[PDB]
């Protein structure tokens, strides 16, 4: 709940895990890879593209 | 039981209210029956006799 109260996003997609199941299950090795790209390249950041 | 009526699913915050804005995915999704894909993507007709 600390992500939707002070910052608005556009694209949010969790592959391999449901976005609503992030509260009951735990986590391990939480790595954050941050970068900046072009709007026409957002569709290229997905497991299985070209 | 068969489900016919489809509604706008909510995945997180921001109430959709039947307008589809942010985090409001569509319940119905299309397939992709094409011979240029793999074996698992091929269509299979399944009949259950009870």
UniProtKB/Swiss-Prot annotation, chain B:
Effect of residue 19 to A: Increased resistance to neutralizing antibodies
Outcome of mutating residue 41 to H: In strain: Omicron/BA.1, Omicron/BA.2, Omicron/BA.2.12.1, Omicron/BA.2.75, Omicron/BA.4, Omicron/BA.5, Omicron/BQ.1.1, Omicron/XBB.1.5, Omicron/EG.5.1
Documented effect of changing residue 20 to A: In strain: Omicron/BA.1, Omicron/BA.2, Omicron/BA.2.12.1, Omicron/BA.2.75, Omicron/BA.4, Omicron/BA.5, Omicron/BQ.1.1, Omicron/XBB.1.5, Omicron/EG.5.1
Chain segments carrying region Receptor-binding motif: 1-44
Top-rank lineage group of the source organism: Viruses
Reported effect, residue 22 to P: In strain: Omicron/XBB.1.5, Omicron/EG.5.1
Disulphide connectivity of cysteines: 16-24
Effect ascribed to mutating residue 20 to Q: In strain: Kappa/B.1.617.1
Residue ranges, annotated region (Disordered): 1-26
Annotated phenotype, changing residue 29 to Y: Reduced host ACE2-binding affinity in vitro
Role summary: Attaches the virion to the cell membrane by interacting with host receptor, initiating the infection. The major receptor is host ACE2. When S2/S2' has been cleaved, binding to the receptor triggers direct fusion at the cell membrane. When S2/S2' has not been cleaved, binding to the receptor results in internalization of the virus by endocytosis using host TFRC and GRM2 and leading to fusion of the virion membrane with the host endosomal membrane. Alternatively, may use NRP1/NRP2 and integrin as entry receptors.
Subunit structure: Binds to host ACE2. RBD also interacts with the N-linked glycan on 'Asn-90' of ACE2. Cleavage of S generates a polybasic C-terminal sequence on S1 that binds to host Neuropilin-1 (NRP1) and Neuropilin-2 (NRP2) receptors. Interacts with host integrin alpha-5/beta-1 (ITGA5:ITGB1) and with ACE2 in complex with integrin alpha-5/beta-1 (ITGA5:ITGB1). May interact via cytoplasmic c-terminus with M protein. May interact (via N-terminus) with host bilirubin and biliverdin, thereby preventing antibody binding to the SARS-CoV-2 spike NTD via an allosteric mechanism.
Name under which the protein is recorded: Spike protein S1
């Amino acid at each position: 709940s600390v992500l939707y109260n002070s910052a608005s996003f556009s694209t949010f997609k969790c592959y391999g895990v449901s976005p609503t199941k992030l509260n009951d299950l735990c986590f391990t090795n939480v790595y954050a890879d941050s970068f900046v790209i072009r709007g026409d390249e957002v569709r290229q950041i997905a497991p299985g593209q070209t | 039981e068969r489900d016919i009526s489809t509604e706008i699913y909510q995945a997180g915050s921001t109430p959709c209210n039947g307008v589809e804005g942010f985090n409001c995915y569509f319940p119905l999704q299309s397939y992709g029956f094409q011979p240029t894909n793999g074996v698992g993507y091929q269509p299979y007709r399944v009949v259950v006799l009870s």
